[model samples]
Target: SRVVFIELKQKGVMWEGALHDARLREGADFWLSVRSSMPGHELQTKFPQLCKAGSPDDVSEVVNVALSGVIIRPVTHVPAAIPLRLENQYFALDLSTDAARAMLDAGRCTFYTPASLGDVKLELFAVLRT
Candidate 1:
């Protein structure tokens, strides 16, 4: 059960993968699900500085194209790098509700460290988006 905080824009968010074509309502704070087809691997489109400090950073995603939509932006102001690995995979990007909310308040985009199970064989990210 992973929870990522969201601030919907009334149009909500158009989601695929775990949630297909779902329109979420806009509001102060909301939670979305983050899950993985693979047990110990998952991703987050929830929040950023794109924090990571362990194996997730070291392993390369098997899909070279997955890199296309992304820009590797990590937080460096307070040196807010999170030293972590996905030993605990989240159904929803493993995001902290409060932390994600803060990002929303600041109007910042959230990101997730790419997930892996030793290496990225992959779980076709979005049925259509992929």
Candidate 2:
């Protein structure tokens, strides 16, 4: 059964091939889901940089774009068992309840641009399960 759920924003503008629904069931998880359209292509291009393969200096660029509402950052880092990849562009970090609450306290979550892509609108989703 599904333990987590996600919903995308309205469609027909910058998001087309993107999936509308995502979920995580017990013992199951999802990593990446490319849109197969404009946004998807944008993601493919941008993911490599966010993974930090290009330059450490680029992290700030990502954080900036994220603040601008181009991407979404996880509340915290993923658990060691999750086996995540930064190159994936969109990712989910495993945050403890305390960490998640801290993020909420910080007010709003956002992601900056990774190094590989341009000013295209790319949607990202993440899910975690036990």
Candidate 3:
């Protein structure tokens, strides 16, 4: 089995600093999970359009679009707990927009295990940018 863990990191900080800053600035990091037992094969077959790109830029565009608040097909097949760990400094900071804060406070930024997946669990995590 193969797992693709995608995490966001700051450009010029160590893991400790990055993690610290992320919580302070973004309130908490976002998390998500996807399971593919057959390595890249399953991913390719499952998300042909996303895998069609040859570079991060190409795939990022698709990701951005998908993450831009559009409702799409469900992804992942596990019953995992997605936790958001925000930066303490930014937890109540006014630097972010009201909409963004609303989303975070409402737990709209996190993804839980998909209903389609039986008793399996999926996990995901994210770091906030500086």
Candidate 4:
């Protein structure tokens, strides 16, 4: 079976219509879940150019808001993966162990295009599953 990545944040919910057709009834518990590859402060430090400020406050805001509540689920057959999209190739972080989190939390990971490629910047803290 295919996996699902659910976002409880308002920013994610606002754009759900385009990604998936599921809808919630008024005042129901949104039990679906997803995972975040990196922590908050790390997100800002990693992508500072995204904002006018030295630290990408805009990007930080989007990430910090989601920390309130995010859920991760892996079944007997399917495993969890950090969803990401890049220009050269779409890549995902291996969250099976602490190393992935360590690198991301430590601000060691970088998302940039090569000199040989166009300046295609990566986008989203968007979630995906398959």
**What is the Cα-based TM-score of model 2?**
0.30
Segments of candidate 4 deviating more than 4 angstroms: 1-90, 126-130
TM-score of 4: 0.24
lDDT (tens digit, per residue) of candidate 2 on 66-85: 22212223323333333344
Q: Model 1: runs farther than 4 Å from truth?
A: 1-27, 40-101, 117-130
Q: Which pairs clash in the backbone of model 1?
A: 34-91, 34-92, 35-91, 47-110, 47-111, 49-74, 49-75
Order the candidate numbers by TM-score, best to worst.
2, 3, 4, 1
**Best model per lDDT:** 2
| lDDT tens per residue, model 3, 1-130 | 2222334332221111112222433444333333433344433234322211111112343532212322223333322333332311011111235434444443333222222322322333443444
The predicted structure with the larger lDDT, 2 or 4, is 2
Would you list the C-alpha lDDT of every candidate in the order shown?
Answer: 0.27, 0.34, 0.29, 0.27
- Candidate 1 vs candidate 3, lDDT winner: 3
Q: Number of the top candidate by TM-score? A: 2
lDDT of 4: 0.27
Query: What's the CA RMSD of model 3 in angstroms?
Result: 15.9
lDDT value, residue 107 of candidate 3: 33
How does each model score on TM-score? 0.23, 0.30, 0.29, 0.24
